[PDB]
Amino acid sequence: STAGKVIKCKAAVLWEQKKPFSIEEVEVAPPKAHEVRIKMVAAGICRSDDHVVSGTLVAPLPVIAGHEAAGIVESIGEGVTTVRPGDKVIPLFIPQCGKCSVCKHPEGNLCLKNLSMPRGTMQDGTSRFTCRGKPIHHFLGTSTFSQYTVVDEISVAKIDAASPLEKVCLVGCGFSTGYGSAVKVAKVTQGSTCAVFGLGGVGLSVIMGCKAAGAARIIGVDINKDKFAKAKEVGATECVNPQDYKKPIQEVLTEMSNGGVDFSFEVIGRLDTMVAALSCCQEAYGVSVIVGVPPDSQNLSMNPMLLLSGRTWKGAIFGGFKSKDSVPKLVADFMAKKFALDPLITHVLPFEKINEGFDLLRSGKSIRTILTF
Amino acid sequence: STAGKVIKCKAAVLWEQKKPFSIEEVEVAPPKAHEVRIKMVAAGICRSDDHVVSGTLVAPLPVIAGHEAAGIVESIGEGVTTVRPGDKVIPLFIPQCGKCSVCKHPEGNLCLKNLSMPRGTMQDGTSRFTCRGKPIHHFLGTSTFSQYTVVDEISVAKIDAASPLEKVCLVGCGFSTGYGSAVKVAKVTQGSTCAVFGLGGVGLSVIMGCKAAGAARIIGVDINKDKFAKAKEVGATECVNPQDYKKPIQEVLTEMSNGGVDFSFEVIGRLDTMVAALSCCQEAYGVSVIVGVPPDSQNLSMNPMLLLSGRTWKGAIFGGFKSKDSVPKLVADFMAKKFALDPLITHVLPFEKINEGFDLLRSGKSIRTILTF
Ligand SMILES: NC(=O)c1ccc[n+]([C@@H]2O[C@H](COP(=O)([O-])OP(=O)(O)OC[C@H]3O[C@@H](n4cnc5c(N)ncnc54)[C@H](O)[C@@H]3O)[C@@H](O)[C@H]2O)c1
Ligand SMILES: NC(=O)c1ccc[n+]([C@@H]2O[C@H](COP(=O)([O-])OP(=O)(O)OC[C@H]3O[C@@H](n4cnc5c(N)ncnc54)[C@H](O)[C@@H]3O)[C@@H](O)[C@H]2O)c1
Ligand SMILES: C[C@H](CCC(=O)O)[C@H]1CC[C@H]2[C@@H]3[C@H](O)C[C@@H]4C[C@H](O)CC[C@]4(C)[C@H]3C[C@H](O)[C@]12C
Ligand SMILES: C[C@H](CCC(=O)O)[C@H]1CC[C@H]2[C@@H]3[C@H](O)C[C@@H]4C[C@H](O)CC[C@]4(C)[C@H]3C[C@H](O)[C@]12C
Ligand SMILES: [Zn+2]
Ligand SMILES: [Zn+2]
Ligand SMILES: [Zn+2]
Ligand SMILES: [Zn+2]
């Protein structure tokens, strides 16, 4: 079949910052030892993929981006034991080698084999993609905006064969990150007051986790008032737009919560909202979690007295989940109806319309657009 | 005999920043409702009292500083029920009203009735001290650099009648703060690697707590190498002087710990060491606690990606302990030989030689100087 052969297929190649993805033919090499070649079925558009196009994130170009997705194994290289041809899988943008000291720690999830922004390759340092005869870089070891991709085994998890890939691709990034940020990283408590800054796909998933944790109050914060209705549908008890007030938003949230909230989340990616989210939590016992990706080459300025009083400030990737252990469990929980993903899906488009999906996100009109291959 | 009447005694008044304390005759009013007048027996010289003199901390002047101390109750105002004349007590620079949101919270200890720097008075907004035809401000509700002081009842804890006050005054600030920072705020784990920046009285107490928690490695960091022998006596496994290295201290500690420490503590009061302490903790699961007091009105600058990878940054006052509940317990623990205080006392002087005590601290030769009244 195609096993052992170079596959020619369609992919979305980003050749330059601030330009449209180029949908064109690429050559995908067969998998080497401990690698998995996957036929993609659905991919979501995450704001971090847009960060590569705007320069917010600096990744080596040209590149095949995409990290929130699901597909079916087409073939495996020598030594693969955790997946087989025909299995439904989700690529893991943070790997889980299971042997490093972070993988063995009870709370860490940033596996030391992670391939972050500067490392635009597979684990062996090379690429499996060619376009117009030129080598193309990988992204986060996943590169899912392609009809076929090749990933390292520690970067892929087998999931339930009955799951709907057009929905569960969100477990690869958006949903898990927000939900885990509330239930695992902040460990929101029953009856608490939470403030969530940013009501995109990840922020809505933080609201779902605060509601599942039993929070009594969930204040959504966004400058785009069109995001409020969906936020309330999934759990927000109130929504506030910072542009409607004469005072800084942290002052407004502190007054609203009678002294500061128990848990706050920054799910935007701005330095001023990271500082405001910290400030609006209660000065002695509040907890603030940074989920948004800050702008490249910019430092945050803050008064350390905000921490000395007793606040906890922390960040996390992928909701704190150890990726290969958690993604299959999250898909099984979805199959058991333990959470819902339809509230995050506002648009469905064929993969070929990827640029239209990115323009929907940039214009503020969508939450998650799912691309179907 | 002195109950209900003004007491004329000596106190150390600070009339101007960067000047010596003046031992002067002051008038101490009798205690009003729910107030306790205390005969001081011993007071420790903490670097935060020196911060008032240097301008690192801004407090309304003139002022009677002092907040680490122990004494005996001389008289009680109307309604007092938790202490009686003749009881040994430790003034609490952070109160425990028992009724506010923080006091009712399981982890929080900055009671909403705390009198911080701008609030140079008793709880009722007035002063009990007069000197040279003028009212003198209080400091942290305690003002212990006086033969007699008056404190609100939510700011005083009764302790064991057989307690050695010349030693347990350190439970009023340095010891408790450092020890709690490790065992209650950071919750140091057995077998972990800790880094302690600053080896003064509070840093040595942090080392005592990390050793009590079973850390496997405790790295003391100080630019004054004369502080290393005592740090190793109380538990440090190694000491490093940043001046001996070409690289910044956070990189040195990251290498020493093969990727970052589990727990780091800033116990100095500098913006750059607060950022260095956060950077030297492990990027996915490290915890950094800010204990030092930074300079007034100055923000720090940092890369938020230090937190997005998974680090936790927090600060705490008085080791996270709820004060009225914890001070008597810590004194009982001292009487039962659960911890030691002599390692922190390097010098003893009469109260009349307070300026010499501050000169000792500023010269780098002392850890804690205990003043006897
Ligand atoms: N930590 C992680 O593992 C991880 C995973 C996913 C996404 N992310 C990051 O999380 C952030 C959210 O991702 P997303 O896909 O939900 O994005 P999104 O663009 O869909 O949502 C961002 C929301 O922030 C709102 N917003 C923008 N500026 C604002 C301001 N100044 N004040 C208040 N609201 C404002 C926008 O209106 C929008 O609704 C991004 O920075 C993304 O890169 C981090
Ligand atoms: N959070 C609280 O509740 C609390 C309570 C007590 C004290 N404090 C603060 O804790 C800090 C320590 O107090 P202390 O009484 O132990 O003070 P201290 O002056 O005895 O000790 C500070 C130590 O830091 C060292 N130091 C200075 N600059 C340094 C540098 N660049 N690198 C490495 N080491 C350096 C000094 O040599 C010294 O040994 C002070 O800022 C004080 O205000 C906070
Ligand atoms: C996981 C996320 C992209 C996925 C997404 O945001 O949707 C990426 C974007 C920026 C990345 C971070 C930046 O490259 C900065 C850091 C680089 C270090 O080598 C690892 C942690 C580090 C903090 C990275 C962790 C993780 O790879 C990040 C946070
Ligand atoms: C407790 C400590 C003084 C005693 C000690 O340092 O030894 C004092 C010095 C500076 C004070 C801090 C500063 O006044 C800044 C903040 C003021 C807020 O109103 C309470 C928290 C706040 C963060 C204060 C908490 C506490 O009163 C501090 C931290
Ligand atoms: Zn993402
Ligand atoms: Zn690993
Ligand atoms: Zn209280
Ligand atoms: Zn002190």
- The CATH code of the domain that includes A84 is 3.90.180.10
Residues in chain B: 373
Rounded to whole angstroms, the Cα distance separating A135 from B251 reads 35
Indicate the SS3 state at residue A148. Answer: strand
HSE (side-chain half, CA atoms, 13 Å) at B316: 34
* Beta carbons of B312 and A314 less than 8 Å apart: yes
Among the partner-chain residues B110, B301, B320, the one whose CB lies closest to the CB of A301 is B301
Last residue of a domain, one of B316, B340, B356: B316
Residues A79 and A117 in one domain: yes
Q: Is A143 left (phi over 0), alpha (psi -120 to 50) or beta?
A: left
Q: Is B320 left (phi over 0), alpha (psi -120 to 50) or beta?
A: left
* CB atoms near residue A11 (< 10 Å): 27
The alpha-helical segments, DSSP class H, found in chain A are 47-54, 101-104, 165-168, 174-180, 201-212, 228-233, 249-256, 271-280, 305-308, 323-335, 354-362
Residues A18 and A156 in one domain: yes
Q: Is B189 left (phi over 0), alpha (psi -120 to 50) or beta?
A: beta
CATH number, position A307:
3.40.50.720
Cβ atoms A33, A78 nearer than 8 A = yes
Cβ atoms B55, B296 nearer than 8 A = yes
Residues B349 and B223 in one domain: no
Nearest CA to ligand 3 atom 27: A116
| B57 interfaces chain A, CB cutoff of 8 Å | no
Residues B217 and B331 in one domain: no
Instruction: Give the closest residue to A117 by CA, choosing from A297, A280, A291.
Output: A297
Residues A47 and A162 in one domain: yes
* Beta carbons of B284 and A311 less than 8 Å apart: no
Residues B229 and B112 in one domain: no
* Beta carbons of A304 and B315 less than 8 Å apart: yes
DSSP collapsed to 3 states, chain B = CCCCCCEEEEEEEECCCCCCCEEEEEEECCCCCCEEEEEEEEEECCHHHHHHHHCCCCCCCCECCCCCEEEEEEEECCCCCCCCCCCEEEECCCCCCCCCHHHHCCCCCCCCCCCCCCCCCCCCCCCCEEECCEEEECCCCCCCCECEEEEEHHHEEECCCCCCHHHHHHHHCHHHHHHHHHHHHCCCCCCCEEEEECCCHHHHHHHHHHHHCCCCEEEEECCCHHHHHHHHHCCCCEEECHHHCCCCHHHHHHHHCCCCECEEEECCCCHHHHHHHHHHECCCCCEEEECCCCCCCCCEEECCHHHHCCCEEEECCHHHCCHHHHHHHHHHHHHCCCCCCHHHEEEEEEHHHHHHHHHHHHHCCCCEEEEEC
**Residue A131 near ligand 3, beta carbon < 6 Å:** no
Of the listed B9, B169, B173, B281, which one is catalytic?
A: B173
| A290 interfaces chain B, CB cutoff of 8 Å | yes
Active site residue B105: no
Instruction: Give the closest residue to A287 by CA, choosing from A315, A258, A313, A320.
Output: A313
Residue A301's φ and ψ, nearest 5 degrees, are: -115, 125
Handedness of CA A116, A117, A119, A122 (dihedral sign): positive
Do the bridges between strand B35-44 and strand B22-28 make them parallel or antiparallel, or are there none, so unpaired? unpaired
Cβ atoms A65, A371 nearer than 8 A = no
* Beta carbons of A316 and B308 less than 8 Å apart: yes
Chain-centroid distance of CA B121 in Å reads 19
| A101 interfaces chain B, CB cutoff of 8 Å | yes
Residues A167 and A222 in one domain: no
Cβ atoms A1, A20 nearer than 8 A = no
Which amino acid, B330?
Answer: L
Residues B147 and B17 in one domain: yes
Residues A306 and A327 in one domain: no
Among the partner-chain residues B105, B298, B300, the one whose CB lies closest to the CB of A285 is B105
| B281 interfaces chain A, CB cutoff of 8 Å | no
> Chain B residue closest to A259 (CA)?
B101
Handedness of CA A269, A275, A278, A282 (dihedral sign): negative
Report the residue of A271, A308, A317 to disrupt the B interface, i.e. the one with the largest count of B CBs within 10 Å.
A308
CA angle B49, B53, B56 (to 5 degrees): 85
Residues A220 and A118 in one domain: no
Of the listed B9, B67, B137, B192, which one is catalytic?
A: B67
Residues A268 and A209 in one domain: yes
Ligand nearest to the backbone CA of A322:
6
Rg (CA), chain B: 20
Nearest CA to ligand 3 atom 18: A116
Rounded to whole angstroms, the Cα distance separating A222 from A219 reads 10
Chain B hits for A285, CB-CB cut-off 8 Å, are 102, 105, 107-108
Handedness of CA A270, A276, A281, A285 (dihedral sign): positive
Residue corresponding to tokens 């958006």: A174
Q: Is A84 left (phi over 0), alpha (psi -120 to 50) or beta?
A: beta
Longest dimension (CA), chain B: 66
| A323 interfaces chain B, CB cutoff of 8 Å | no
Residues of A involved in catalysis: 46, 48, 51, 67, 173
> With breaks defined as C to next N over 2.5 Å, after which residues does chain B break?
none
Q: Residue A268 corresponds to which tokens in the numbers above?
A: 């935007």
**Residue A51 near ligand 1, beta carbon < 6 Å:** yes
Angstrom distances, CA of residue A33 to CA of A30, A115, B177: 10, 18, 54
**Residue A368 near ligand 1, beta carbon < 6 Å:** no
Residues A169 and A213 in one domain: no
Rounded to whole angstroms, the Cα distance separating B56 from B319 reads 21
Query: Which of A45, A48, A228 to mutate to test ligand 1, by most ligand atoms within 8 A of the CB atom?
Result: A48
Please give, rounded to a whole number of angstroms, the shortest distance from the CA of A345 to a CA of chain B: 26
**Residue B243 near ligand 2, beta carbon < 6 Å:** no
Chain A hits for B282, CB-CB cut-off 8 Å, are 102, 108
Residue corresponding to tokens 């955790």: A82
Instruction: Give the closest residue to A101 by CA, choosing from B354, B258, B8.
Output: B258
Q: Reply yes or no: is the peptide bond before residue B135 cis, omega within 30 of 0.
A: no
HSE (side-chain half, CA atoms, 13 Å) at B229: 4
Last residue of a domain, one of B316, B336, B363: B316
> Chain B residue closest to A57 (CA)?
B305
CA angle B30, B95, B27 (to 5 degrees): 20
| B284 interfaces chain A, CB cutoff of 8 Å | yes
Instruction: Give the closest residue to A130 by CA, choosing from A11, A42, A275, A5.
Output: A11
Residues in chain A: 373
Among the partner-chain residues B298, B311, B316, the one whose CB lies closest to the CB of A314 is B311
* Beta carbons of A102 and B299 less than 8 Å apart: no
Number of domains making up chain A: 2
* Beta carbons of B301 and A304 less than 8 Å apart: no
Element holding A350 (H helix, E strand) = strand A345-350
Q: Residue A68 corresponds to which tokens in the numbers above?
A: 């929130």
Question: Which range marks the domain in which residue B362 is found?
Answer: 1-177+317-373
Cβ atoms A28, A149 nearer than 8 A = yes
Method used for this model? X-ray
